[PDB]
Amino acid sequence: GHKKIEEGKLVIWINGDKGYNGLAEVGKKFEKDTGIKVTVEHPDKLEEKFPQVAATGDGPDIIFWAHDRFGGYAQSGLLAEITPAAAFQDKLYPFTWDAVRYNGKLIAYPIAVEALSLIYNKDLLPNPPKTWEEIPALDKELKAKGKSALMFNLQEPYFTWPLIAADGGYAFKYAAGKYDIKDVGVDNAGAKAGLTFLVDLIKNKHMNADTDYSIAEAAFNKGETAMTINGPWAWSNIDTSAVNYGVTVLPTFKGQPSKPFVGVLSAGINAASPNKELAKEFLENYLLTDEGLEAVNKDKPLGAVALKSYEEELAKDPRIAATMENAQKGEIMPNIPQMSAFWYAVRTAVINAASGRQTVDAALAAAQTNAAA
Numbered sequence: 001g002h003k004k005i006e007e008g009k010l011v012i013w014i015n016g017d018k019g020y021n022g023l024a025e026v027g028k029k030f031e032k033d034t035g036i037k038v039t040v041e042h043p044d045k046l047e048e049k050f051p052q053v054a055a056t057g058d059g060p061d062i063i064f065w066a067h068d069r070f071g072g073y074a075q076s077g078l079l080a081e082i083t084p085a086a087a088f089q090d091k092l093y094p095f096t097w098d099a100v101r102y103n104g105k106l107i108a109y110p111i112a113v114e115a116l117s118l119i120y121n122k123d124l125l126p127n128p129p130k131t132w133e134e135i136p137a138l139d140k141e142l143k144a145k146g147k148s149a150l151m152f153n154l155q156e157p158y159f160t161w162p163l164i165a166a167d168g169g170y171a172f173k174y175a176a177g178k179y180d181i182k183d184v185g186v187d188n189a190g191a192k193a194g195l196t197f198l199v200d201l202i203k204n205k206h207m208n209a210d211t212d213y214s215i216a217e218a219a220f221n222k223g224e225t226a227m228t229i230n231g232p233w234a235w236s237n238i239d240t241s242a243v244n245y246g247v248t249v250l251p252t253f254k255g256q257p258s259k260p261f262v263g264v265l266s267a268g269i270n271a272a273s274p275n276k277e278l279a280k281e282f283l284e285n286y287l288l289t290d291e292g293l294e295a296v297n298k299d300k301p302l303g304a305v306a307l308k309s310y311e312e313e314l315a316k317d318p319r320i321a322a323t324m325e326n327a328q329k330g331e332i333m334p335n336i337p338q339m340s341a342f343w344y345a346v347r348t349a350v351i352n353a354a355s356g357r358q359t360v361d362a363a364l365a366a367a368q369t370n371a372a373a
């Protein structure tokens, strides 16, 4: 890594929860056809490392993340403008392009639409609950049989946001077709109700504040818990397990739907890459094809891909129908540079409230001020 970005090869960064072995296979096909070697890496804290190394002219040729970080990368000067032809643009849904547009420029290729769904064990729970409010009662009932109702990652605000946003929580107000960076909705009554409900689930021992991705995945996949909250990428490991699972609508809170933040998995080209044409060729002609997306989706499901041709095939899968039904109830993440600060603030708020180190009201009051920074 001592020679900066090397000309005549492609280095790709993608998060470890994604289908990197699939993407590697698309890499191999590219190498066979072009002679250009493609390396797929999955470094820890990818989304934090990229801006550090990209600024010095290092790091990958291509970076994969949800669109929410890309505005920051672009504002920081780390992303090449992408120049897809109208012919190519027509192959992907316009709303996916909308997610990767910053100051009227396209700054990434959209790949797939992700939203959290309720995942339930059909053998333990033939009828999943429609409301958050009925989960304590269900937990009391399952705890008698040595089970629990619900376990999900409490360490990442992505997973708790849906409950927080349900009764009127929001990140940045979309007003007059723009995001108001002065109008943050993390310390409003809805957000407070939402987080208070979550902290109560913990106080009444229906959930544990320390529960992370691994613990929740293990618990559900061993059939110790009736329900989890997760994204398409998680289905592969549940398939391999004994569990007969359904993916369905998230529970309502105070009779309003859970509002998951919708992410578009996106591929940006490092502004310092000397391999931009090769990156464009790889993403347009190899990855964003039925065969390309199929290779990745076979490893770990992408959700609802941006490519119309392949989306029409996958749309018939009720898991993806449920993904899109959840997506339609939530709102697409902003890509504005402030999202990084917002996420850091909400992360701290939820951990501090869940651990009991701070009150919900104080935790969220602090987050609100910190988000505008």
Ligand SMILES: OC[C@H]1O[C@H](O[C@H]2[C@H](O)[C@@H](O)[C@@H](O)O[C@@H]2CO)[C@H](O)[C@@H](O)[C@@H]1O
Pocket (backbone or CB within 6 Å): 015, 017, 047, 066, 067, 068, 069, 114, 156, 157, 158, 159, 231, 263, 343
């Ligand atoms: O939790 C804050 C985190 O939320 C999102 O990250 C998700 C990501 O979108 C999913 O595709 C998957 O990788 O899991 C992540 C949750 O750990 C935001 O995109 C990210 O910026 C933010 O830090």
Ligand SMILES: [Cu+2]
Pocket (backbone or CB within 6 Å): 001, 002, 003
């Ligand atoms: Cu080196």
